[PDB]
């Protein structure tokens, strides 16, 4: 997370999950995600500053 203008994408990635993307990670080597609607909205509002 940032501090001058605090930002941590992971929390708002949970908010993105609230939007509804498919995220799967069974081990640290293995992960994959699909159906992500979080970036454009979460970042656009989040990064408005």
């Amino acid at each position: 997370s940032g501090y001058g203008k605090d930002g941590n994408i992971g929390i708002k990635d949970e908010d993105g999950m609230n939007c509804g993307p498919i995220a799967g990670s069974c081990t640290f080597p293995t992960t994959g995600t699909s159906k992500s609607p979080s970036p454009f909205v979460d970042l656009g509002a989040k990064d408005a500053t």
Binding site: P39, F40, V41, L43, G44, D47, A48
Partner: protein, 49 residues
């Protein structure tokens, strides 16, 4: 004594001098204020200032 007091009486019975005092107040206030808010927002690639 009568006459001397009479002379003083004549001098003393003098009208007190009234003066009309006219004081003028002049106030001039000039205010110029300009503010610019410039916004470059795009949610397509998440670039918004």
């Amino acid at each position: 004594r009568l006459d001397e007091l009479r002379r003083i009486v004549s001098q003393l019975d003098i009208p007190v001098r009234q003066v009309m005092i006219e004081a003028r107040i002049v106030e001039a206030n000039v205010g110029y204020d300009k503010s610019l808010g410039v916004r470059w927002g795009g949610a397509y690639h998440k670039g918004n200032w």
